[PDB]
Design a protein around this ligand. Structure first.
Ligand code: CHL
Ligand code: CLA
Ligand code: CLA
Ligand code: CLA
Ligand code: CLA
Ligand code: CLA
Ligand code: CLA
Ligand code: CLA
Ligand SMILES: CC(/C=C/C=C(C)/C=C/[C@@]12O[C@]1(C)C[C@@H](O)CC2(C)C)=C\C=C\C=C(C)\C=C\C=C(C)\C=C\[C@@]12O[C@]1(C)C[C@@H](O)CC2(C)C
Ligand SMILES: CC1=C[C@H](O)CC(C)(C)[C@H]1/C=C/C(C)=C/C=C/C(C)=C/C=C/C=C(C)/C=C/C=C(C)/C=C/C1=C(C)C[C@H](O)CC1(C)C
Lengths: 73, 68, 197, 156, 42, 193
């Protein structure tokens, strides 16, 4: 939670649009939409049937996480 | 004529034992075996049932206070 | 005595020894004797000061609307300009009352303790009855008998009621209650709580 | 901290305008008399008078066109926390005291569980309205020390 | 008859009716005071 | 008693000058704590009693403010003044040094002596004329010192709060101003609540 808060705050400040944070950070759907959904769109397209990118590893590693975690269950 | 130990009857007792569910608890004597070869001759009923479902157990006299 | 419900039995709390008993406790508050004493004293003081207040409301209003005098409304008297500013008289009130009321409370906690004026040793006080103080309060030698305490308490209860009425009617209206009475006498049906909402 | 009341700010007016505008644009797809269209216009005027009411009670108002409470303690803005807070505290004390008194009363029976599952609705009714005493009564309790216990922990 | 009274005094039904009454009170207040955000009485 | 009706707690049976039976926080339940509190009370009242006229005397007569008497320390070239006399060595370092040495040295040599009665009441060479002549008079003047010093401490609290509410003023000044006009020059303007 702490790191979510810090990262969203800074990722808004760096783009100069802290206004968006202040507006749509008070309703959870705002967090799921403006913070996770959108900011993940550069990642999940790391590798597609049209090739790959520098981001490939992370995308791969990303999925890796969402697997190992599940195995814990 | 030999003085029977333990309270008489109905005497609400305060438990002094530590390792029972009713430590600092208020129970009721139901009888005491006058045999001096026992090692826990008093027996007490409660109004609160413990984890094992039981509601009675044994004690000596040292672990009792004859409150009233 | 006069149970205000011709069928209900009075609880054991209010036997009839204390003045004004009617068994009027449908919520069993004072069923503890010391709290009963507490509320006796509280009712006494509230009723006395409520009588005072309702007099200070009604009598000035009618004497002004009569043309004999001129004095603002009890609510319109705050902003008025006197020889003394508000805060001055307020702090003087505060100190004098923090003396008198704390003496009253000390008497409440301890029957017959703080009797004498601790300045001079004669002139002090004849022993009293709690809630009904002694000499320097009843100069006319009125005998504290029954039908005096009952009349006191009844007048004081009705005074409390009338004061709450004054306050809430000023809230809804802001006008002089005697003007409400005049409008009422004009037409009680056209003038009541119903129309003003 | 610079929060102007939206009796005077602008973004509030912009929010109000856009809301009533989308509502009105939705309104013109039915008969001007159809009960659904009637309820639509009703909600339009309702949210309008809401915006009006908000522009009547000193509501300091954000830089983005939104109300923002001021709970700093200053009773100037007290119609948000202080008075509703003490009102809810009164209600909660009511409920807590009435429940505690009911339980303390019904404790004296054969197996109080039978009356804890199936309430003594008669005793419940003649115990329930005592709420008006919860501040004062408990008070005296603490005065007389009849509210807490010292070394009785289990059993009762 | 008294049996059905003691049955009605069983916590489920009593709770359901109590909660229904409370919810009705709340929704009626909301109807008579739409959006009711502040305390504009004092 | 200071309070009528409220009974005196156990360990306040008079038996000491100044004991009018006031201890609502029960700090005096400890004998050593009690004697230490008596000693510190005597120190406090005695200091404040010496140190109120050191404010009054200058404030009225030829001096200025009781805050500016030390103004010499705020600025570099400050030199103290005796009613209009800048003594040659009234500079900051010398008075600082004599304060340090005298106060520390003395109060050490005096405190390190445990009579224990001499601590609260020195006497010794501070009673060669025998103002301890009369024991009745002795306890009486003890009570007198305690009361006067309690008052002086109250007076210092008043000085503090007054100079706070009135930035840069004088006790006698504010007294003359308020007296000059009764019902609108007082604590009222400060505290409605
Ligand atoms: C406790 C009972 C009491 C009542 C019912 C009132 C009544 C009132 N006083 Mg008040 N006073 C009371 C105590 C006292 N007043 C005053 C001296 C003043 C002043 C100087 C003023 C008031 C004012 C007010 C008004 C506050 C506005 C309001 O009601 O907001 C809802 C109100 C009509 C103000 C006023 O009259 O404006 C209309 C005002 O200026 N009062 C003193 C002596 C310091 C009091 C001591 O108890
Ligand atoms: C001494 C008590 C007393 C008296 C004489 C009055 C008298 C009056 N009140 Mg009033 N009032 C009182 C207490 C009292 N009130 C209390 C305690 C409250 C708070 C609940 C109110 C709240 C109130 C409102 C909100 C309004 C009035 C109004 C009025 C006036 C028109 C009557 C009316 O609308 O019904 C009065 C309405 C009430 C709710 C009063 C209830 C009083 C209770 C039931 C006790 C009184 C019983 C008493 C024994 C019977 C009357 C005694 C009398 C014949 C001597 C009238 C002058 C109206 C007004 O000024 O318009 C002209 C108005 O709008 N009153
Ligand atoms: C502050 C005002 C006050 C106080 C302290 C009392 C106190 C008392 N009254 Mg009482 N009374 C009052 C106002 C008050 N009354 C008023 C205005 C009326 C007229 C409507 C009456 C009419 C009345 C009757 C007819 C009788 C009493 C009785 C009593 C005594 C026992 C009942 C009790 O415990 O009440 C304690 C009361 C309280 C703790 C008040 C709590 C605050 C409540 C919730 C206020 C209600 C809502 C409020 C308007 C807001 C007790 C000494 C009975 C008695 O024993 O006589 C000797 C009795 O027969 N009173
Ligand atoms: C230590 C934290 C603390 C506490 C206990 C309170 C508590 C209170 N404040 Mg307060 N307040 C706080 C922090 C706090 N506030 C902060 C951080 C600010 C902003 C700097 C304020 C500004 C503030 C104002 C402006 C006022 C209060 C008032 C009050 C009292 C009503 C209440 C007791 C009011 C008061 O004094 O009583 C009316 C009042 O007017 N508060
Ligand atoms: C009137 C009954 C009553 C009272 C006076 C209290 C009082 C208290 N509870 Mg509590 N509690 C109750 C019922 C009650 N409880 C019930 C029924 C449950 C089970 C759901 C709990 C579960 C509970 C937990 C888990 C905790 C407390 C805690 C506490 C303490 C702090 C307040 C708090 O955190 O509550 C928070 C509020 C609640 C938990 C809501 C419960 C209140 C219920 C809904 C009221 C029940 C009323 C009754 C059943 C309805 C019948 C009405 C009448 C006609 C008979 C306080 C001593 C805390 C503690 O230990 O503090 C040190 C804590 O951690 N309570
Ligand atoms: C500093 C200081 C210290 C250490 C003490 C210490 C003590 N005071 Mg004390 N006191 C002080 C300042 C101090 N007082 C001031 C400034 C006042 C005036 C407000 C008082 C008024 C006072 C009273 C009225 C009483 C004490 C009492 C006591 C004793 C308990 C204890 C020795 C009690 C006692 O036994 O007197 C010696 C007692 O009855 N004090
Ligand atoms: C006006 C208040 C006042 C009163 C009533 C007393 C009273 C007393 N002082 Mg004293 N004293 C005071 C102010 C006062 N002092 C101040 C302001 C200083 C500084 C001193 C410094 C002082 C010393 C240094 C000594 C006394 C001693 C004494 C006592 C013996 C005579 C007597 C109880 C003497 C003592 O020890 O008493 C036995 C003692 O040696 N006092
Ligand atoms: C020792 C007695 C004493 C005396 C004679 C004065 C004298 C004065 N004070 Mg004062 N004051 C004192 C103690 C005292 N102070 C203490 C101990 C405090 C802190 C609690 C204060 C806090 C204080 C404030 C906050 C104000 C004054 C003000 C004043 C002035 C007029 C009002 C007044 O009489 O104060 C009343 C004195 C008291 C209530 C002290 C208690 C008296 C008992 C009986 C002894 C006057 C110069 C006012 C002023 O200068 O006008 C703007 C003002 O605003 N004083
Ligand atoms: C109504 C009231 C209390 C009523 C309580 C009642 C009925 C309680 C009844 C119950 O408890 C019992 C009996 C038994 C329970 O089982 C049932 C209930 C129902 C719970 C108190 C009013 C009490 C009202 C009081 C004390 C009013 C005092 C007014 C004053 C001092 C006026 C002052 C001023 O008018 C002047 C003097 C000058 C003006 O210019 C300015 C001001 C300041 C406005
Ligand atoms: C001279 C001069 C001049 C110049 O110019 C300047 C100068 C320098 C400043 C000066 C001065 C100096 C000095 C010396 C000072 C000091 C003072 C003091 C000591 C004080 C105290 C002071 C002190 C004080 C008050 C104290 C107080 C206290 C108190 C209240 C307490 C109380 C109490 C008690 C008992 C007990 C109980 O149970 C509780 C209580 C309640 C808690």
């Amino acid at each position: 939670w702490v790191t979510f808060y810090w990262h969203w705050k800074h990722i808004t400040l760096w783009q100069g649009n802290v206004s968006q944070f202040n507006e749509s950070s008070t309703y959870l759907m705002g967090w799921l939409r403006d913070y996770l959904w959108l900011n993940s769109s550069q990642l999940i397209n790391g590798y597609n049937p049209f090739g790959m990118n520098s981001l490939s590893v992370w995308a791969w590693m990303f999925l890796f996480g969402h697997l190992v975690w599940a195995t814990g269950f | 004529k030999p003085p029977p130990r333990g309270p008489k009857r109905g005497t609400k007792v305060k438990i002094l034992r530590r390792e029972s569910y009713w430590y600092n608890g208020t129970g009721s004597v139901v009888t005491v075996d006058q045999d001096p070869n026992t090692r826990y001759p008093v027996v007490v009923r409660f109004a609160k049932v413990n984890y094992a479902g039981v509601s009675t157990n044994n004690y000596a006299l040292d672990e009792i206070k004859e409150v009233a | 005595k006069g149970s205000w419900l011709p069928g209900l039995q009075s609880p054991a709390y209010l036997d009839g020894s204390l003045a004004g008993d009617n068994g009027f406790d449908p919520l069993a508050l004072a069923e503890d004797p010391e709290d009963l004493r507490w509320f006796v004293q509280a009712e006494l003081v509230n009723g006395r000061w409520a009588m005072l207040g309702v007099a200070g409301m009604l009598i000035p209003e009618v004497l002004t609307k009569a043309g004999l005098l001129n004095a603002p409304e009890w609510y319109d008297a705050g902003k008025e300009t006197y020889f003394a500013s508000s805060s001055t008289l307020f702090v003087i009130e505060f100190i004098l009352f923090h003396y008198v009321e704390i003496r009253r409370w000390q008497d409440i906690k301890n029957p017959g303790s703080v009797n004498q004026d601790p300045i001079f040793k004669s002139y002090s006080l004849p022993p009293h009855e709690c809630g009904y103080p002694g000499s320097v309060f009843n100069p006319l030698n009125f005998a504290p008998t029954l039908e005096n305490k009952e009349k006191e308490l009844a007048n004081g209860r009705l005074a409390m009621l009338a004061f709450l009425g004054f306050l809430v009617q000023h809230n809804v209206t802001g006008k002089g209650p005697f003007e409400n009475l005049q409008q009422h006498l004009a037409d009680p049906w056209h003038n009541t709580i119903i129309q003003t909402i | 901290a610079g929060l102007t009341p939206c009796k005077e700010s602008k973004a509030f007016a912009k929010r109000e305008k856009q809301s009533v505008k989308k509502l009105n644009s939705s309104l013109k797809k039915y008969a001007p008399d159809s009960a659904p269209a009637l309820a639509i216009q009703a909600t339009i005027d309702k949210t309008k008078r809401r915006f009006e009411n908000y522009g009547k009670f000193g509501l300091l108002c954000g830089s983005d066109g939104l109300p923002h409470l001021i709970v700093s303690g200053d009773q100037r803005h007290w119609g948000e926390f202080i008075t509703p807070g003490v009102l809810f505290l009164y209600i909660a004390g009511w409920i807590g005291w009435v429940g505690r008194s009911y339980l303390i009363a019904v404790s004296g029976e054969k197996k109080p569980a039978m009356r804890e599952i199936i309430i003594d609705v008669e005793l419940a009714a003649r115990i329930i309205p005592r709420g008006f005493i919860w501040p004062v009564a408990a008070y005296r309790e603490l005065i007389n020390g009849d509210l807490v216990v010292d070394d009785a922990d289990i059993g009762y | 008859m008294r049996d059905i009274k003691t049955y009605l005094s069983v916590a489920p039904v009593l709770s359901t009716l109590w909660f229904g009454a409370l919810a009705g009170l709340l929704i009626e207040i909301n109807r008579l005071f739409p959006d009711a955000l502040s305390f504009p009485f004092f | 008693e200071w309070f009528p009706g409220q009974p005196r707690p156990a360990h306040l049976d008079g038996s000491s000058p100044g004991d009018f039976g006031f201890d609502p926080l029960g700090l005096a339940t400890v004998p050593e704590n009690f004697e230490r509190f008596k000693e510190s009370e005597i120190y406090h009242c005695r200091w404040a009693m010496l140190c109120v006229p050191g404010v009054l005397v200058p404030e009225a007569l030829g001096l200025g403010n009781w805050v500016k008497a030390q103004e010499w320390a705020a600025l570099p070239d400050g030199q103290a003044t005796y009613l209009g006399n800048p003594v040659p060595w009234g500079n900051l370092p010398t008075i600082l040094a004599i304060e340090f040495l005298a106060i520390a040295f003395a109060e050490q040599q005096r405190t390190m002596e445990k009579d224990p009665e001499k601590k609260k009441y020195p006497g010794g060479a501070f009673d060669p004329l025998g103002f301890s002549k009369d024991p009745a008079k002795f306890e009486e003047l003890k009570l007198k010192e305690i009361k006067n010093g309690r008052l002086a401490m109250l007076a210092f609290v008043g000085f503090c709060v007054q100079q706070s509410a009135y930035p840069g003023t004088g006790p006698l000044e504010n007294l003359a101003t308020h007296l000059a006009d009764p019902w609108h020059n007082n604590i009222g303007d400060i505290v409605i609540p």
